């Protein structure tokens, strides 16, 4: 069972706006997608110093990258707060028309893509590189959820049926024909040095065999 809903048209316009226009800048994608991961995890961290039973559903605090050439996918994991089926549809979708308009705005007054982070939604940064993008979510207060998106002004939510995953968000980014660079190893090795440096949790790069 599956439910489509419609972007909100500011939102549908931004990622018309990312995924058209020229710019050949688009490894901040992977910035802005960690840089998610790293809030994820401190909302999750700050909530276990009052109540250590929120990481029952998973201790252990991290960031992994999972390049997959075969399938074409790039995949961030993390292990922080999740986010409820009322993220997806309503919450979280409400804090982003804001952070959209403004972006816009400034992206007319001298600002380029690369500033994304500084209004909130750098999420669609992800659609720079990828055609289309599966996110599978977790809450320690809601069922497991599966997001996804090829933009089009639409966006599907369905209850996720595949491997339990306790706590945390999985961003599938279904990579464009001309974005395979962001599979290989060396190249986000550099981009995660040059980047995501300074972030207190561990990224591990999964290697392929
Ligand atoms: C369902 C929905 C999603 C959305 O954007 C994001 C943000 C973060 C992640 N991980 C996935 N999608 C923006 C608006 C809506 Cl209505």
């Given at each position: 069972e599956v439910e489509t809903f419609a972007f909100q048209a500011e939102i549908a316009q931004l990622m018309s706006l990312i995924i058209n226009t020229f710019y050949?800048?688009?490894?901040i994608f992977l910035r802005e997608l960690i840089s998610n991961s790293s809030d994820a995890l401190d909302k999750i961290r700050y909530e276990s110093?009052?109540?250590?039973?929120?990481?029952?559903?998973?201790?252990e605090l991290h960031i992994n990258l999972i390049p997959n050439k075969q399938d074409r996918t790039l995949t961030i994991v993390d292990t922080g707060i999740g986010m409820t089926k009322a993220d997806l549809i309503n919450n979280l979708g409400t804090i982003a028309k804001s952070g959209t308009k403004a972006f816009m705005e400034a992206l007319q007054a001298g600002?380029?893509?690369?500033?994304?982070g500084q209004f909130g939604?750098?999420?669609?940064?992800?659609?720079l590189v990828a055609e289309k993008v599966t996110v599978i979510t977790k809450h320690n207060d809601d069922e497991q959820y599966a997001w996804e998106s090829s933009a089009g002004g639409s966006f599907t939510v369905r209850t996720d049926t595949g491997e339990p995953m306790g706590r945390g968000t999985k961003v599938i980014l279904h990579l464009?024909?001309?974005?395979?660079?962001?599979?290989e190893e060396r190249r986000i090795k550099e981009i995660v040095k040059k980047?995501?440096?300074?972030?207190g949790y561990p990224i591990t790069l999964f290697v392929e065999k």
């Open positions: 050949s800048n688009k490894e110093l009052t109540d250590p039973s929120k990481l029952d559903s998973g201790k600002a380029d893509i690369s500033m994304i939604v750098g999420f669609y940064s992800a659609y464009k024909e001309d974005q395979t660079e962001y599979l980047h995501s440096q300074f972030i």
